[PDB]
Amino acid sequence: SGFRKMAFPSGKVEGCMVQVTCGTTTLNGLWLDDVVYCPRHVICNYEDLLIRKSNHNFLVQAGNVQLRVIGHSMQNCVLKLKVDTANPKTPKYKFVRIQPGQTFSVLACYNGSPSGVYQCAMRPNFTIKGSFLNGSCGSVGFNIDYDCVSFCYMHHMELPTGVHAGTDLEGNFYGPFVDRQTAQAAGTDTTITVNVLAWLYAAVINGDRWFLNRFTTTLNDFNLVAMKYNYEPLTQDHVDILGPLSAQTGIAVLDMCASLKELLQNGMNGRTILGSALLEDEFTPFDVVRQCSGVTF
Amino acid sequence: SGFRKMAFPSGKVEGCMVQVTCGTTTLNGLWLDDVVYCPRHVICTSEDMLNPNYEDLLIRKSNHNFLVQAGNVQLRVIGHSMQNCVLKLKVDTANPKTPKYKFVRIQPGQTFSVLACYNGSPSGVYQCAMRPNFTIKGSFLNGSCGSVGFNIDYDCVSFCYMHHMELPTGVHAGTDLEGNFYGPFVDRQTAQAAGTDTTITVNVLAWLYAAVINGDRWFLNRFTTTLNDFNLVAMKYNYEPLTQDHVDILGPLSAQTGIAVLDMCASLKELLQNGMNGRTILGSALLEDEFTPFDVVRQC
Numbered sequence: 361s362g363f364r365k366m367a368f369p370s371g372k373v374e375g376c377m378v379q380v381t382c383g384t385t386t387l388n389g390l391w392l393d394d395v396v397y398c399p400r401h402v403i404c405n406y407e408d409l410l411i412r413k414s415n416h417n418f419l420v421q422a423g424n425v426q427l428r429v430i431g432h433s434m435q436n437c438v439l440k441l442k443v444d445t446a447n448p449k450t451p452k453y454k455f456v457r458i459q460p461g462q463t464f465s466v467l468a469c470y471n472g473s474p475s476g477v478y479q480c481a482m483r484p485n486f487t488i489k490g491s492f493l494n495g496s497c498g499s500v501g502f503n504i505d506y507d508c509v510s511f512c513y514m515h516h517m518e519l520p521t522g523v524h525a526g527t528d529l530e531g532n533f534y535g536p537f538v539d540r541q542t543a544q545a546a547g548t549d550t551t552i553t554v555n556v557l558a559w560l561y562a563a564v565i566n567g568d569r570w571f572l573n574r575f576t577t578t579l580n581d582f583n584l585v586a587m588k589y590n591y592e593p594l595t596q597d598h599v600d601i602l603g604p605l606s607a608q609t610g611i612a613v614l615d616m617c618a619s620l621k622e623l624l625q626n627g628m629n630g631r632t633i634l635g636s637a638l639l640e641d642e643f644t645p646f647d648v649v650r651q652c653s654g655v656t657f
Numbered sequence: 658s659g660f661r662k663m664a665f666p667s668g669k670v671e672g673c674m675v676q677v678t679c680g681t682t683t684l685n686g687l688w689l690d691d692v693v694y695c696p697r698h699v700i701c702t703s704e705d706m707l708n709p710n711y712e713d714l715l716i717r718k719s720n721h722n723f724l725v726q727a728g729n730v731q732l733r734v735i736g737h738s739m740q741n742c743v744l745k746l747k748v749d750t751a752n753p754k755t756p757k758y759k760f761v762r763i764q765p766g767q768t769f770s771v772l773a774c775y776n777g778s779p780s781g782v783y784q785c786a787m788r789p790n791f792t793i794k795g796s797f798l799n800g801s802c803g804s805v806g807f808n809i810d811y812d813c814v815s816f817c818y819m820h821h822m823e824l825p826t827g828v829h830a831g832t833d834l835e836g837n838f839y840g841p842f843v844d845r846q847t848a849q850a851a852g853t854d855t856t857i858t859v860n861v862l863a864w865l866y867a868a869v870i871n872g873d874r875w876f877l878n879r880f881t882t883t884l885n886d887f888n889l890v891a892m893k894y895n896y897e898p899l900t901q902d903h904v905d906i907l908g909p910l911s912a913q914t915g916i917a918v919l920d921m922c923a924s925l926k927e928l929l930q931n932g933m934n935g936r937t938i939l940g941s942a943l944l945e946d947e948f949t950p951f952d953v954v955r956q957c
């Protein structure tokens with residue numbers, strides 16, 4: 361029993377965190393094989409600024425060991441520093457780009473040293489509601505599949521509202537953001553509907569049933585109400601993904617939607633669900649199954 | 658900016674997780690140097706759970722009864738001893754991944770990260786606090802026993818908790834790494850009830866300071882209060898008494914935000930009276946009590 365916001369064990373990623381220093385700027389890098397990946401703003405026209413840098417301008421520190429940079433290239437907003445040594449702690453890994461609503465763990469680092477790990481979702485507006493201070497740039501987001509680390513995020517900046525923006529490991533930004541000091545605003549956020557439903561299933565599995573009702577709804581009727589309360593549209597794919605939880609709890613997805621529909625039109629009424637007075641949307645259907653079944657890494 | 662419930666990076670603890678099997682029971686062990694620590698109820702059978710005599714059951718066991726698995730490598734047990742509710746299995750190999758560590762007994766209100774394991778394999782890391790009733794509100798399934806709570810400060814791992822049992826209310830009970838239970842609990846299937854839980858007041862105040870640092874000021878007011886008047890109100894909302902030690906601990910946050918502790922105490926009093934009124938504080942509609950004053954300074 362119990363439901364917690366749980367991150368993947370960060371050990372395989374801690375073995376890859378290095379400190380990248382270029383001029384006055386010091387941020388984090390991801391050392392995989394003989395390449396160190398980091399935000400290209402560490403050099404701060406990026407083609408022009410990068411052509412003026414040499415390999416000895418980048419000071420890479422893996423613990424108390426300085427790595428010698430033997431090459432540098434740029435892939436979108438990520439700088440790739442070729443180093444002489446392959447990271448012996450390199451795990452089985454993949455670079456994946458996640459969709460909004462998908463969750464991942466963030467290993468927050470300062471000066472190439474991991475200081476914290478937390479779970480979070482890629483918001484539908486492509487920002488993450490992280491917790492980052494100066495020096496956290498280059499901190500990475502990841503998921504673990506069996507023994508494979510899927511790197512899905514690299515932190516680049518903080519928007520004026522306190523939310524965060526970054527890229528996948530191929531340097532492609534999530535969202536309409538640029539790695540530059542200019543006026544940038546995150547779009548109005550929406551609630552990740554499928555994740556709220558997954559969290560409602562997790563509450564039922566934990567014995568919290570007060571919100572359940574006899575009612576069911578059509579997907580079209582639910583989406584009319586979802587649009588109204590700034591909730592993301594629920595697709596048939598989402599309904600299918602919630603299938604195993606629906607089978608386990610015996611509550612059809614559209615039956616759980618009528619409960620969500622009522623929770624939105626009426627509220628919690630002083631009650632909580634899994635110790636929360638708000639509807640939690642940072643647990644995907646897969647996260648709920650993983651936590652309420654005990655999958656290990 | 659931003660405030661999140663943040664756990665410590667679990668890497669140093671993942672390198673210590675092993676699977677301990679004794680008879681039919683399989684739980685997790687903590688392998689540090691040449692010793693594997695695990696809950697002593699790993700030696701328990703079906704009719705040795707309501708009233709087990711652990712000294713008696715342990716004397717009947719031999720080193721080859723304990724099957725220890727560190728990854729795909731079986732470790733050889735060369736000794737066994739019991740320290741309170743923890744079983745210490747001496748092994749023939751020192752863990753090369755043993756970090757700088759200490760065994761630390763924490764007080765209620767203190768926070769720590771939990772590395773949840775099943776079969777000696779870490780599956781997730783989360784953050785939680787030792788509740789005033791000495792239970793933890795974890796996320797644990799069968800086989801999680803022996804999962805450890807820890808803090809990682811300045812390269813060192815302070816182990817402060819080992820998971821032992823789930824109480825009938827879904828909350829969890831365990832011990833420090835010296836086998837001493839937190840709370841009035843025992844490792845027996847007897848009827849055990851957690852005392853009525855209370856809110857960790859100092860942690861709520863620390864979280865209110867964290868919100869002020871993050872630009873949330875809507876809950877602040879022109880009022881201040883006496884410590885006794887705050888405790889008289891707080892006790893009625895099932896909040897822990899705020900001691901002068903707690904007031905002193907909140908000092909640095911009070912200096913940083915320019916809001917006296919007793920002034921923040923009056924903001925809290927008001928929040929308890931009115932509720933949030935559809936508003937949130939750090940993205941939360943409830944007052945958060947699992948961030949200590951030390952955590953807030955750490956994160957901010």
Ligand SMILES: O=C(Nc1cncc2ccccc12)[C@@H]1CCOc2cc(F)c(Cl)cc21
Pocket residue numbers: 361698706797798799800801802821822823829843844845846847
């Ligand atoms: O509770 C137990 N460990 C679990 C841990 N965390 C979470 C759980 C969730 C579900 C089922 C077991 C859970 C065991 C087995 C069941 O009974 C006892 C009784 C005892 F006196 C002791 Cl010391 C341990 C246990």
